[PDB]
Structure formats: structure tokens, C-alpha cells
Ligand binder design. Structure first.
Ligand SMILES: [Mg+2]
Ligand SMILES: [Mg+2]
Ligand SMILES: [Mg+2]
Ligand SMILES: [Mg+2]
Ligand SMILES: [Zn+2]
Lengths: 56, 99, 144, 139, 158, 114
RNA sequence: GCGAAACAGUACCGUGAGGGAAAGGUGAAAAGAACCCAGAGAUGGGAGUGAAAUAGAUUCUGAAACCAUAUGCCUACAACGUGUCAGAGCACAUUAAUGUGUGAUGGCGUGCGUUUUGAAGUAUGAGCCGGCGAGUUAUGAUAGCAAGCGUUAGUUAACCA
RNA sequence: UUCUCGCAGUCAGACAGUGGGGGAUAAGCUUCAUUGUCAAGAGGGGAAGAGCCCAGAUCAUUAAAUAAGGUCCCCAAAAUA
RNA sequence: UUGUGGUAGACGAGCGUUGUAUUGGAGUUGAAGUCAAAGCGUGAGCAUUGGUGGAUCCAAUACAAGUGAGAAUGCCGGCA
């Protein structure tokens, strides 16, 4: 099944309205400073005041 | 105050000190033209026309209206004739009206 | 060329009205209502500015249809489904829903247009004498 | 006071780069470097480096304030394309076109920086009408 | 043309079943390989004819108008000599006779060689035997110097 | 001699495109569509340059009917009262404009009552 | 224009005969962009040479289709071959002009070529832009118009200088 | 609209009124004679219609009188008996 | 005064392009080409100013043609 008429530059742009991205939530790890995405462990390897990994 | 005047073939409602555009009058800039035909000068209605009544105007300028570019085109039948037109006009304003 | 015709624009001022549709007939009332809404009778009718007045119609159920129409002429309404014809009769319209009758009879008299749907909302058809639109201070005139 | 930075023919699509370039545009630089590092896109590892390079160019070269910076205007223009053939059923050989993107990021210092471009626009027509008028003296 | 181009008489596509144009041959006028359909050919004749008597009429009238136009100074054999192979003396003669910016034409009967040794490096001017002046070559002159002899010849030719 | 001539074609197409600006979508971009729309627009111009004097007269009639209906007579009776009695060539618009400056119009509508 | 302005009958297709392309230009001269910052690096941004680096090796000019950014105006009850004639409000200010951009709202409005008795067409062609592309030529015939020459007229061909 | 000379194009027609054939006084059927129109022709009426009625567009005018058709609203225009 | 709708189709007058010829003339104090602009023409079409660009070009009269593109399931390139 093919298009019978080309979908113009107007209909296409409207479809992509819902394609925009979301800014993912960001938290600031305590025990160092940086913006780790929230509910993860930052590159410190420290999650909260507990150690779960190596230096970076 | 007002008056109704037949200049060219169009009847105009005209007060003191108003500028209106009529069809070409063959009269150079700055001269005073006395439009002759008139009806309903001031509460005084001439039936055919108001006799011995004129409106005295000073011609301001001769101009050409905006271009009208008429193209006529029979559909699917070998015809695309084109023509352009710039109707000339004269803009003029009134000084006072002869009673 | 010539002096441009005068045409009011957003210079609209609209006064309410009241007509008590006691013993009038449907269509003769409806044309007068349609003209009053459109402002067709205004001395300065600009065809694109809703220069017309508001209107409130009272005692809708008392309006009368001449002849035997009360049992012979039907009003139809169709949903987009199949078998969705709802077919009601003049006697049943003068009892069950009377305001809808005058509303529809008025709307059809307006042009297929973009103010028609904005004109028609200037018609308030209460079924009975009482109303809650005494606040707007309407005038009152007979048979319009 | 713009201090842009451009990368040409990056092997990314123009239409995938425009999705994160929208995230970064208009926002301050402190909440751009990190917000762009943290997003899970191929179009982010390719713009974090470029944005940081633009930061460094602005700070060293032109000498702007830094913490007054903001990402003025972001795009991903179409870079040159590559054409390749792809086999198919029965040998029909469609053409795959690899895309590319000429990314460029501009970093302004003063909060407005937009009426100035309009000012240049208006000057470019003011001088045209002026040259037109000075040539009406053909009498 | 369509045929001389090193070209393929092979039909590029089958006539039908492949959805494309018909396109019989690769070297057609509308392809870009290019068979120029009509083009210019090396055989065009480019030649016009004029009755001899009409030509005598034209030459006679152009001589009549040019020879009464206050520039046709008559010349003698003497200054064809007394001008060495050098052209400087000829340029002095032109300058003194206020004939610099004109295009003066010398007409001669005996074809002297000192004269044409000069004026050859001059792009403006040129010397011709009587039998070598044409209607164009004469009505282009805008100034000419006839030698006194050729009149006797010219009157005979009308 | 060979002549290419890409100047003239582009200039002509540029004029056609410049004619159609403020057109939706591609109608101002592609020339093939721009020419169709310019032709059609000029057809509409030719038809409307006649329909508008067909319609303005109707509007004047309507706004004169409304004014006369509030004095006790209709427009279809007023025209007699201009032609046959007190022969007047007052135009069909100006008798309309005279309501926008009224109380000089009432002089008309009561003048023909004679 | 030779198929071919360059390492073209090359690369490539075909078992084979054979078929068979595309693309050139820095600047006057490399003075081919040492050095610094970011970066792993290409590269980019300053510096530097230079008349110009919007001439930077993507290298004369650099349209259009096309993809992104932005001032100004409109649009989320609306039936739309998408424009036109009227017309408000809004924002600006010109090849000085009854001016410019948008255009809530009214009236009106079934594309272009082709072929057909007749197509908006449920008949067909074109996805869009640019370029290329179709009544010429030789030698004779008749007719019209103009010119030279003329009442024992007019006129040269080949060839020769 | 007769005569001579150069130059073509055309030879698939359609419908409405009228008089008949074939047809079944069936066909938007077919074949003819005739009057128009369309083709090759727009505007108004017809709600919408190539072929009906009125008419026959040089272009502009935000001028006036009319033809067919029509006057409660849509849709401009009327009342009395 | 009579007219001026129009396909096929007959006839007339014309614009533009490329080059040659003679005649005038502009050009690094910025030529053509290219975009933009709120101009002028009855039409084909024609100017004016500014940015870019970095060397040829414009008008008048004749002459000669590879002379004028929206369609060929057109060819080539690019792009949706
Ligand atoms: Mg289809
Ligand atoms: Mg999606
Ligand atoms: Mg055509
Ligand atoms: Mg098909
Ligand atoms: Zn941390």
C-alpha cells in the first residue's frame, strides 16, 4: 500500500511534534559534586553514603 | 455643509476641505475647476440638477492607479492572452461651494 | 474611482430584547428573530461584524402550528449510525422539547457561514415565562 | 561576541542531531554540558565535545565572562551525503544514502544579542534606500 | 547527427514490461550522449549573386557620393615617392593633412612599392589597385586619396 | 553558432514566482504550480472586478431598505417617489450614505411626500 | 565539442564477440595556514602571511528544488483546487507611493497540457528544481513582394587571374 | 455569398424544438430534412447541468435604466383588491 | 461612423537571445553573472539602488542562426 499523494512538508512536520525529547531528571550526588541522573550511582562509585564501585 | 456633486459619471458626497479622486479631467495641476452639475447642495434639492450652482475645486494631481494585470486563459484550449491596465485618475480637493 | 462605502468595524453595540411568544406561529416568528439576530434591519448593516442584537424568547411551548401539521409533519434527527433516524411529530415537539423546536427553526434560516454558529448563540429560548436573564435589562417589544 | 564552533560531515543524521540540539538551545551553559552528557543518545557524545570546545574558544579567544554565557542558537545543517548500493531480492539494487551533519553552536554573552542582528538587517536596507535617494539627484 | 556519433544501435531497454520510457537508442537527440538533430553542416553555400549591371550601378553611385564629399583629395605619383620605406613620413603627411582618426584609402593604378611599404604597419589605412576596390571597401573609406591617372580609367568603366 | 540562454528562462520564471507571494505551501516555491495559481488568481480577479459592483449595489439597496422601513414605507415604493414625482437623479449609494449623517436624509424621505 | 581537456577505450558489465561512463579553475606567488586554547584526533576557534582567509586546500563565481534558526502578524468549533473581491485589528516605514507584511470575518470559487461529441474528472502525462531536447540544409518548381536591366531584350555556368 | 490567384484546416459530431423511417409513437438509441445552441462561447435564470430561456465579454468605475426569471429568511427586491 | 469573444487555421506588426561588421562609449573610483527591493511599459520584456563578485561589456542600424520550454511513463545531475 502506497501513498496516492505526497505528504507535504506541512503534514510531516506536524507528525513529529510528539518526537521531542525529555530532559531526564538530575540529582547532585552528595560525597562529591556532580550531576548524576537521579536514582543512580555517580561515577564516584558512591551511592548516598555507601560505596558500590571503584573510583570512576 | 455637505453637497452632492456629479463629477465624471460618479456622484460624490463632499464637504469642505476633502480630497477625492475622479476620472481624468484634462486640466493641469493647480488650476481651479468649477464642477457644474450638482444636486442637493444644502437642504436645497434640485430635481433634474441644482441650477446655477457649482462646486469649486483645486486639482491636486494626475496619477495612475495601481496596475491591474488581466490575463485571460481558456482552459485546455490553446489560449493565454495577457493585458495590463493602469487607469488614470485625478485627485482634487474643494475650496468652497458657490451658493 | 469613488468614495469608499462606509463600513463599521468592531464598532458594535448590542441591546437585548424580549418577545413573549404566546400565540405566534413558528415561521413568522422565526424570520423576525433571524433578522433581529443578524441585525438586518440596522441602518448601518456591515455584512461581516455581527452587528445584530440579542434575543430571549419566552413561553416557547405556547407557539402554534397552523393546519393539521401537528400530526403530519415530522422533524428528523440522524446520528451517524444506521437505523439512527429519530422521527418526532409536531404535537410531540410542542410538548417534550419546545425550545429546541424554535432553536432549530431559527438556525436553518441563517446562512451556511462562520458567524451563523456565533449568531445563533445570541438566541435564548426559555420554554416558560420565568427566566434568569432579568439582570441584563432587556427592552420588550411585541411580535418580533 | 558569539564565538561559535563548527564540526563538519559528522557521521550522524541531521534529523537525529536536531533532537538533542533542541534540548540544549536557549539554556545556560552550566546546565548544558551536564544535561548533554547525561542523555542517552549518539547525538550527545558528538555535541558535548563540540560545546566544550566552544566554551574554551569563547573564554580564551574572545575573552567573555563565562558564567554569563548561554547557548544562543543551535542547529544541525545537512552535511555532504554518501551514496551506496544495496542488494535486494532478484537483484534490484536500491541506493542507501548515508547522511551527515555540519553542527555549529553559537554562545552569546549578553542576554539580548538578537536585536543586534535585527539592527544589522535594518542598516542593510537603510543604506539601500539611502543610495537610492542619493541617485534621485540625476537632475 | 544521430548516426555519426560513436553509438549504440543496441536498444537500451525492452520496449515493454520495464516501466520506463521507450527510448530506442542511447545516442538520440534528447539524450545527453548527443545526436544533434539538425545542427550546422559544412556544406552551406553562403553565397549571394548580383547582376553585373546592378553591380556597376552600385559602384557608380558609391563613387559618385564618395568623390564629392570634401575629402577625396586627388594625389599624384610624386608623393608616392618622396616618402621612403619609413612610415614616419607618412604619419607626418596624415597628421598635417588632418586625416589621423579617419580611415584613409589610397587607390593607385601602377601599385607603387614605397607607398605600400608604408601604411602596412598602420592598421587604419590601406592601399589598393583600382581593380581591387569594392563597394564596401570604398564606402567604408570615410576619406580617400585618388591618383590623377585612374580617372581616365574610371570614366571608361562608368 | 550555439546559444544556451539560461538567463532569459530564469528571469521569466522569476517574474511568475514573484507574482505569487503569500501563497500557501509550495505554491510560492515551485514555478509550475506558481503559474497555475497566478492564472487562476487573475481569472478570479476578472470575475470579481464585475461581481463586486454586482454586490455593492445590492448592499446599498439593503441599507436603504432598512433606513426606509423605519419611516413607514418600503424601498420598492421610494424609487417611484423619486422618478415620477420630483424627478431626481440622486444616486443609489449617496441616499445610503446620507443615513450615516442622518437628519439630512429625513429631509429626502419627507420631501417626496408631496 | 572526438566516446576521451585528467594515466579513456581506462574503471566497470559480460565466459565471449562486444557494450562502455563521470568529473577541470586557490592565489599573481604557498607566503599550504609555525604558535596558543578545547579535544584522543581529524578538526574548530584566535594568531600569522596576504589586497581579501565569506580566497584555507570542501579550494573561480555559487541560483533553484531542499533542510534548519529568527524579528513582525495570524492559527487549537473548524468543511478548506487553498486564491480572489471586500475588511477589521496588529507591527513597521518605502525604487513616496490614494504605501508595506500578516489577514479574525462576509461574498465567490470543482487545477495545467493532451485527446475527445463532451473531461474537475472514478481517462490518461508530469514527485520537485536546474540544464539538454523537436520544421533545418543542398539542388531544382510555382506563387507573392522588392530591386537591377529592357524591346532583336535579360543572363551567365564550368573554368582562368 | 459572383470570378481568378496563394495558403490551409475539416470528413469520430452532440443535444433541444419540429416532420417522418428503423425501433415496441422504448431508449441520453440509431438514420435523415429543417431551426437553433454547443463545439470553437464567458454572464443571469435554471439549486447544481456544454447543448433549454435570455444574451453575444475591448479594459477600468464602490454610476443609471432593463431582458428572461423573481420579490417571508437563506437571497437583492411588493403592496393592495 | 462601424466595430474589437474565439480552438483548428490564413495574414500583419513586434520583444528577446548568440555572434560578425562598421559607428559612439562605460569599466579595479569595480565589468558581466547572482540574490534582494515598497519601480516603468498594451505584451513579449525593460530600467534604478545596495550586498556579493573580481574582468569584460552596453546602446543605435544591418547581417547570420545549434535562437526562445511546463508536459514526450523524455535524457543527465541533485533533492524531497
Ligand atoms: Mg489516479
Ligand atoms: Mg513519531
Ligand atoms: Mg503548451
Ligand atoms: Mg491508470
Ligand atoms: Zn559523586
Amino acid at each position: 500500500a502506497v501513498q496516492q499523494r505526497r505528504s507535504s512538508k506541512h503534514r510531516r512536520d506536524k507528525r513529529r511534534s510528539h518526537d521531542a525529547l525529555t530532559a531526564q531528571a538530575l540529582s547532585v550526588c552528595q560525597k562529591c559534586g556532580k550531576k548524576k541522573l537521579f536514582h543512580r550511582v555517580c561515577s564516584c562509585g558512591m551511592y548516598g553514603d555507601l560505596r558500590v564501585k571503584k573510583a570512576y | 455643509m455637505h453637497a452632492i456633486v456629479v463629477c465624471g459619471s460618479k456622484q460624490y458626497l463632499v464637504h469642505e476641505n476633502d480630497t477625492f479622486f475622479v476620472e481624468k479631467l484634462e486640466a493641469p495641476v493647480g488650476k481651479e475647476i468649477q464642477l457644474d452639475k450638482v444636486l442637493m447642495l444644502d437642504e436645497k434639492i434640485g430635481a433634474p440638477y441644482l441650477e446655477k450652482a457649482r462646486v469649486v475645486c483645486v486639482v491636486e494631481k494626475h496619477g495612475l492607479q495601481r496596475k491591474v494585470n488581466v490575463i485571460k486563459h481558456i482552459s485546455q484550449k490553446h489560449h493565454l492572452k495577457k493585458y495590463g491596465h493602469r487607469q488614470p485618475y485625478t485627485k482634487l480637493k474643494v475650496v468652497r461651494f458657490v451658493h | 474611482k469613488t468614495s469608499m462605502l462606509t463600513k463599521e468595524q468592531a464598532n458594535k453595540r448590542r441591546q437585548w430584547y424580549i418577545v413573549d411568544a404566546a400565540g405566534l406561529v413558528l415561521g413568522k416568528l422565526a424570520v423576525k428573530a433571524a433578522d433581529l439576530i443578524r441585525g438586518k434591519n440596522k441602518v448601518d448593516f456591515t455584512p461581516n461584524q455581527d452587528c445584530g442584537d440579542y434575543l430571549i424568547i419566552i413561553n416557547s411551548d405556547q407557539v402554534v402550528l397552523t393546519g393539521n401539521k401537528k400530526e403530519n409533519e415530522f422533524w428528523y434527527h440522524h446520528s451517524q449510525y444506521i437505523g439512527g433516524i429519530k422521527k418526532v411529530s409536531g404535537r410531540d415537539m410542542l410538548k417534550k422539547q419546545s425550545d429546541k423546536l424554535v432553536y432549530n427553526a431559527v438556525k436553518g434560516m441563517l446562512p451556511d457561514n462562520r458567524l451563523s454558529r456565533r449568531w445563533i448563540t445570541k438566541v435564548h429560548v426559555f420554554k416558560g415565562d420565568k427566566h434568569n436573564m432579568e439582570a441584563q435589562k432587556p427592552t420588550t417589544l411585541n411580535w418580533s | 561576541m558569539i564565538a561559535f564552533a563548527k564540526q563538519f560531515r559528522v557521521r550522524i543524521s541531521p534529523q537525529k542531531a536536531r533532537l538533542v540540539c533542541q534540548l540544549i538551545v536557549g539554556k545556560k551553559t552550566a546546565d548544558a554540558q551536564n544535561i548533554l552528557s547525561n542523555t542517552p543518545k549518539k547525538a550527545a557524545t558528538l555535541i558535548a565535545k563540540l560545546l566544550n570546545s566552544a566554551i574554551a574558544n569563547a573564554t580564551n579567544n574572545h575573552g567573555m565572562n563565562g558564567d554569563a554565557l548561554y547557548v544562543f542558537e543551535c542547529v544541525a545543517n545537512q552535511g555532504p551525503s554518501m551514496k551506496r548500493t544495496i542488494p535486494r531480492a532478484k537483484g534490484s539494487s536500491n541506493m542507501i544514502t548515508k547522511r551527515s551533519s555540519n553542527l555549529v553552536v553559537k554562545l552569546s554573552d549578553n542576554p539580548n544579542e538578537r536585536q543586534e542582528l535585527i539592527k544589522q538587517q535594518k542598516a542593510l536596507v537603510k543604506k539601500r534606500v539611502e543610495g537610492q535617494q542619493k541617485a534621485k539627484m540625476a537632475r | 547527427t544521430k548516426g555519426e556519433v560513436r553509438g549504440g544501435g543496441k536498444k537500451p531497454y525492452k520496449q515493454k514490461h520495464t516501466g520506463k520510457a521507450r527510448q530506442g537508442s542511447t545516442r538520440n537527440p534528447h539524450f545527453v550522449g548527443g545526436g544533434i538533430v539538425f545542427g550546422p553542416k559544412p556544406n552551406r553555400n553562403y553565397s549571394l549573386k548580383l547582376n553585373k549591371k546592378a553591380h556597376t550601378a552600385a559602384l557608380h553611385t558609391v563613387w559618385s557620393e564618395k568623390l564629392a564629399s570634401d575629402n577625396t583629395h586627388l594625389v599624384d605619383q610624386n608623393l608616392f615617392n618622396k616618402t621612403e620605406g619609413k612610415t614616419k613620413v607618412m604619419m607626418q603627411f596624415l597628421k598635417s593633412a588632418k586625416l589621423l582618426d579617419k580611415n584613409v584609402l589610397f587607390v593607385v593604378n601602377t601599385l607603387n612599392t614605397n607607398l605600400e611599404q608604408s601604411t602596412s604597419n598602420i592598421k587604419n589605412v590601406q592601399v589598393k589597385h583600382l581593380d581591387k576596390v569594392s563597394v564596401r571597401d570604398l564606402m567604408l573609406a570615410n576619406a580617400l586619396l585618388v591618383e590623377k591617372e585612374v580617372l581616365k580609367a574610371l570614366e571608361g568603366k562608368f | 553558432m550555439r546559444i544556451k540562454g539560461g538567463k532569459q528562462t530564469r528571469v521569466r520564471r522569476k517574474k511568475w514566482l514573484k507574482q505569487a507571494s503569500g501563497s500557501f505551501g509550495t505554491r510560492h516555491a515551485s514555478y509550475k504550480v506558481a503559474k497555475q495559481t497566478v492564472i487562476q488568481a487573475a481569472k478570479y480577479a476578472y470575475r470579481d472586478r464585475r461581481n463586486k459592483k454586482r454586490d455593492f449595489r445590492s448592499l446599498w439597496i439593503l441599507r436603504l431598505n432598512a433606513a426606509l422601513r423605519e419611516q413607514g414605507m418600503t424601498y420598492s415604493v421610494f424609487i417611484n417617489l423619486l422618478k415620477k414625482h420630483n424627478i431626481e437623479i440622486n444616486r443609489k449609494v449617496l441616499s445610503e450614505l446620507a443615513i450615516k449623517e442622518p437628519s439630512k436624509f429625513n429631509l429626502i424621505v419627507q420631501k417626496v411626500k408631496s
